[PDB]
Design a binder for this molecule. Structure first.
Ligand SMILES: [Cl-]
Ligand SMILES: [Cl-]
Ligand SMILES: [Cl-]
Length: 129
């Protein structure tokens, strides 16, 4: 599913991501924009052989099981395929664990490089939330 901008903001809020660990909704929408362009089916293969999955490009080295990332963990206790669903529940619940791991949203390199320090509220501007 490719979400609309406000549609995704609303879904993220519904699932308790808004201001989670102090990160406003615009941060999460911005991260999703640059990780996946709001496409739940997004996948990308990393140089180390791990793969990133879903709207927030959650990585199989630590967070989910895909059966093909040697030496990896599955800390969200989910198949990586769950992160591709039109229902963002699994991605949100896993993201909550990731952002609580110590480095906040810096875990998402694209958030650090493209969202951090910017006017992230622009991502939810105009949205009925
Ligand atoms: Cl915001
Ligand atoms: Cl594996
Ligand atoms: Cl980047």
């Amino acid at each position: 599913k490719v979400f609309g901008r406000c549609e995704l903001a609303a879904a993220m809020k519904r699932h308790g991501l808004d201001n989670y660990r102090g990160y406003s909704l615009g941060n999460w929408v911005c991260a999703a924009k640059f990780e996946s362009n709001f496409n739940t089916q997004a996948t990308n293969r990393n140089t180390d052989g791990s793969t990133d999955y879903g709207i927030l490009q959650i990585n199989s080295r630590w967070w989910c099981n895909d059966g093909r990332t040697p030496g990896s963990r599955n800390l969200c206790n989910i198949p990586c395929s769950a992160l591709l669903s039109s229902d963002i529940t699994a991605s949100v619940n896993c993201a909550k664990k990731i952002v609580s791991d110590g480095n906040g949203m810096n875990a998402w390199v694209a958030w650090r490089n493209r969202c951090k320090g910017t006017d992230v509220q622009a991502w939810i501007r105009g949205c009925r939330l």
